[PDB]
């Protein structure tokens, strides 16, 4: 498929390493590029954690309304929502939204804590059939993104398959699946990434990721004009530790794979 040549071209131009997995739910067809290679997830991992919390709330029916304490010492490097609530509290719902829609790192650490550490986020992945995801660290160190380090990684194929089960399948209860999709469709950080390569009429929920080595990621559920939904993972990392983000590469990958 010319799609392979275009993604290769894109990758070469960019100077980095590009991973892509597209699932077309119209017929289960896939478009795959380095789809079995590991990449640092950075903030795209917030989807597994918010989902895991949603799964716990299937049993603990009030859990999303539980207030959680935010102390000044809980603040980390990017706390756009949580900083408003220091010496106060946010609900687990508020925290899940802040993590997903604002990429709030404080909010992610609270989700992590609620699940019993990075291992509880990994346990949830395993419960829904994802044998590849691993979360190893909290924010912000889960973003180091060191070339060859397996920590805090997954593969595009695995993340796409998981995002399909979570947003379109039966990994979560119907209310919880709906809540996840609502959160993702309200993301504030995504217009420069996958969405930017798609026709304006298409509806999208996504989570972006950013970290070291110019790691620039996005995972998305997509409801095109006139077509069954798609899942798309676009992962991108660079050779230089202080490399600049490249959201435009993800936009470009999305354009390439949804023409074909």
Q: Which residues bind a copy of itself (CB under 8 A)?
A: 78, 80, 101, 185-193, 196, 200-201, 203, 210, 247
Whole-angstrom CA distances from 139 to 10, 143, 176, 232 are 30, 7, 25, 25
Encoding tokens for residue 163?
A: 């995002």
CB of 80 to a copy of itself, least distance (A): 6
CB of 65 to a copy of itself, least distance (A): 19
CB of 140 to a copy of itself, least distance (A): 12
10 Å Cβ neighbour count for 94? 21
Q: For a copy of itself, which is the closer residue by CB, 192 or 243? A: 192
Picking from 149, 123, 256, the residue whose alpha carbon sits closest to that of residue 211 is 149
* Contacts of 28 by beta carbon, 8 Å cutoff, 6+ apart: none
Catalytic site residue from 14, 43, 45, 57? 43
Q: For a copy of itself, which is the closer residue by CB, 63 or 196? A: 196
Measured between alpha carbons, how far is 220 from 194 in angstroms, rounded to an integer?
7
Tell me if 18 sits within 8 A of 34, measured CB to CB: yes
Q: For a copy of itself, which is the closer residue by CB, 73 or 200? A: 200
Measured between alpha carbons, how far is 200 from 183 in angstroms, rounded to an integer?
19
Q: For a copy of itself, which is the closer residue by CB, 1 or 200? A: 200
Task: Report how far apart the first and last C-alpha atoms of the chain are (Å, whole number).
Answer: 8
Tell me if 176 sits within 8 A of 55, measured CB to CB: yes
CB of 120 to a copy of itself, least distance (A): 28
CB of 259 to a copy of itself, least distance (A): 15
Measured between alpha carbons, how far is 176 from 51 in angstroms, rounded to an integer?
8
43 in catalytic set:
yes
Picking from 17, 3, 30, 257, the residue whose alpha carbon sits closest to that of residue 145 is 17
Q: For a copy of itself, which is the closer residue by CB, 155 or 187? A: 187
| Residues labelled as active-site residues | 43
């Amino acid at each position: 498929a010319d799609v392979q040549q275009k993604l290769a071209e894109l990758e070469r131009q960019s100077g980095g390493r590009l991973g892509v997995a597209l699932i077309n739910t119209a017929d289960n067809s896939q478009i795959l590029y380095r789809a079995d290679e590991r990449f640092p997830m950075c903030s795209t991992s917030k989807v597994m954690a918010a989902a895991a919390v949603l799964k716990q709330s299937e049993t603990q029916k009030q859990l999303l309304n539980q207030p959680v304490e935010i102390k000044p010492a809980d603040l980390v490097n990017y706390n756009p929502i949580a900083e408003k609530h220091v010496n106060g509290t946010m609900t687990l719902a508020e925290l899940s939204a802040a993590a997903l829609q604002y990429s709030d790192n404080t909010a992610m650490n609270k989700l992590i804590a609620q699940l019993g550490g990075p291992g509880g986020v990994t346990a949830f992945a395993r419960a829904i059939g994802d044998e590849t995801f691993r979360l190893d660290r909290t924010e912000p160190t889960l973003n180091t993104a060191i070339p060859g380090d397996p920590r805090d990684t997954t593969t595009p194929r695995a993340m796409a398959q998981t995002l399909r089960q979570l947003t379109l399948g039966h990994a979560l209860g119907e209310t919880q699946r709906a809540q996840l999709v609502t959160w993702l469709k309200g993301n504030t950080t995504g217009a420069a990434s996958i969405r930017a390569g798609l026709p304006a009429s298409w509806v999208v929920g996504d989570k972006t990721g950013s970290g070291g080595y110019g790691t620039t990621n996005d995972i998305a559920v997509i409801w095109p004009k006139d077509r069954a939904p798609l899942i798309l993972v676009t992962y991108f990392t660079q050779p230089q530790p202080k490399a600049e983000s490249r959201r435009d590469v993800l936009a470009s990958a999305a354009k390439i794979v949804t023409d074909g």
